[PDB]
Subunit: 95 residues, 2 copies
């Protein structure tokens, strides 16, 4: 039970970051892509203001990486775990 608690906690950080329609939408779009914040706002149809908080959560919990080019911030998926989970969700629900 203890080791199951140990692992369940970390998995749950990941799940809690994914368990939101907007954060999941972002993650799904980043799968095998690098997208700007402008593109994310356009595709999600959320203002950049509402977007920034979702992105902030994904940055804080380590699900996403960033880089800056001129006036553009580019996001990609980060961890092996999130990539694997997004791939799977894509196959079950999209592909």
């Amino acid at each position: 039970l203890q080791e199951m608690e140990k692992n369940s906690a970390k998995a749950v950080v990941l799940l809690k970051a994914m368990a939101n329609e907007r954060r999941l939408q972002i993650l799904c779009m980043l799968l095998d892509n690098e997208l700007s914040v402008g593109e994310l706002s356009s595709r999600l149809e959320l203002s950049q203001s509402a977007l920034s908080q979702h992105l902030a959560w994904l940055r804080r919990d380590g699900l996403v990486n960033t880089r800056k080019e001129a006036q553009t911030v580019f996001y990609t998926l980060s961890s092996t775990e999130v990539k694997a989970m997004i791939e799977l969700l894509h196959r079950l629900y999209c592909q």
Copy 2:
């Protein structure tokens, strides 16, 4: 990517809790009674019952009854592949 993401999010919300996830991982490739679950999880049956009600409501588990024993299993293809993946990722 709106309706399917919404279904996915119902699943993820059901999984995004340490006790609920524990229940689901234990049910993987298994069928367990309420007693077996409570025994392994070290929860009161009422506490366990709260989590189970959530899992049944959202379609992640099937139940059946024999005598006065209730038995649980995972339900869908989606839930099973998600648990299998998680087990691979976090339980080496």
